[PDB]
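To assess whether ligand presence alters the predicted conformation, the chain was also submitted together with JX8. Input:
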Amino acid sequence: MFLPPPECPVFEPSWEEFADPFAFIHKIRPIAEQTGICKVRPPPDWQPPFACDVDKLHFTPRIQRLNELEAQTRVKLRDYTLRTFGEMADAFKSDYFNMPVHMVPTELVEKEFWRLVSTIEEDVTVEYGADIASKEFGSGFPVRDKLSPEEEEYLDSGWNLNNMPVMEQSVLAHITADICGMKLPWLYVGMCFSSFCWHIEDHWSYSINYLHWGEPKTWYGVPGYAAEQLENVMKKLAPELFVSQPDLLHQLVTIMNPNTLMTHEVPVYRTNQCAGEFVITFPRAYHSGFNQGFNFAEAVNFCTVDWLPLGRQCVEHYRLLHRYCVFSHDEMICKMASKADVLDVVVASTVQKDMAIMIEDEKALRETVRKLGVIDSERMDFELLPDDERQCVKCKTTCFMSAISCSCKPGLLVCLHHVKELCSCPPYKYKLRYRYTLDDLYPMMNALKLRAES
Ligand SMILES: Oc1ccc(-c2nnn[nH]2)c2cccnc12
Ligand SMILES: [Mn+2]
Ligand code: NA
Ligand code: NA
Ligand SMILES: [Zn+2]
Ligand SMILES: [Zn+2]
């Protein structure tokens, strides 16, 4: 009926290995990128303090229908307190099974979840919390400021997820743009059967997820190399999800039985994440799951230097699909280049290689555009435009290195792949808008080269 996928890798790093989270993720990457997800059990004495008043934490609940292959929208950025939500969640689970809330086997919850989502007769609706930290509901990890206890030793931990949007080895930290949906940690309050649909993280980034407390979270993960296999399977069984959407807050995702994927030769792995354990998702690794009961998790995206080539591939993939970007990859690269003197040495080396590809591609695109008859040009500071004012009309990519404009359509832009998609004017009426000349870009790359040599 339901055949559980094989278990994903579980790591138990020693203290020395657990020290640098980025060094450890780099160490386990050859194993875990084969499974998409993996579990990290921290050293036994790594125990961050969790303290909260369940009566003063409020949040707006989200409602969720549990029907396989039904379209759901990705969460965007009525009221429960944490106590009243917990009482609702506990009464729901215990009444669903007629068993004490904490005595329902996890195997049975898994079997029952995949039964109810597939039965048209069942009409189970659950609720959950999902948002970034705010004054009414803050991070589960300690943050600076009133007076913190001596458990401020977890303030500067690499595994304190609030430090991920600031650590140097995360290239997302250097982004000046306000991408709070991606840079800041998300807080997830779950209950029995509340679920996250199959998805990958934006720009094919990593994510790391910590379960602060509560009943386990059940995960299904698919390695990054099988991403296109999974999408082809879902295109057959749910074509309505693959209709192009007007913006980022309209993306369609769904619940789907992993046995359906396994039947179509898609490798799927599972794990039960328990309180105090991390789950790490790797670039382009599809994942979904559900909560066994009342719990509280915190998750954040991040990008290592290993990710830089994949991040460029992803934006190219977004362009082919006409999907909106969260940020401009080229803007991030150039921002780091302009800070080459204070960059980590290994970061500088990796950024330099990506920038060399960027420059070669940009040079060829400008040659192609010049051969189409675009002659006039002017420097343009793309980073000053709001993101929705610098998307290619055709493919929706966020422009930064260059774009084409015509005075007959004020404010509209196309990227250099879509010069023919702007208007019916002859190309000599167009202007190439460019952030940098080639003569600006090579010294920027040389700064990274010099920095990479100590
Ligand atoms: O990558 C993710 C992992 C887990 C979750 C999650 N945990 N509990 N409920 N949902 C989640 C939610 C929204 C977006 N992404 C998510
Ligand atoms: Mn996610
Ligand atoms: Na159902
Ligand atoms: Na994608
Ligand atoms: Zn375009
Ligand atoms: Zn025109």
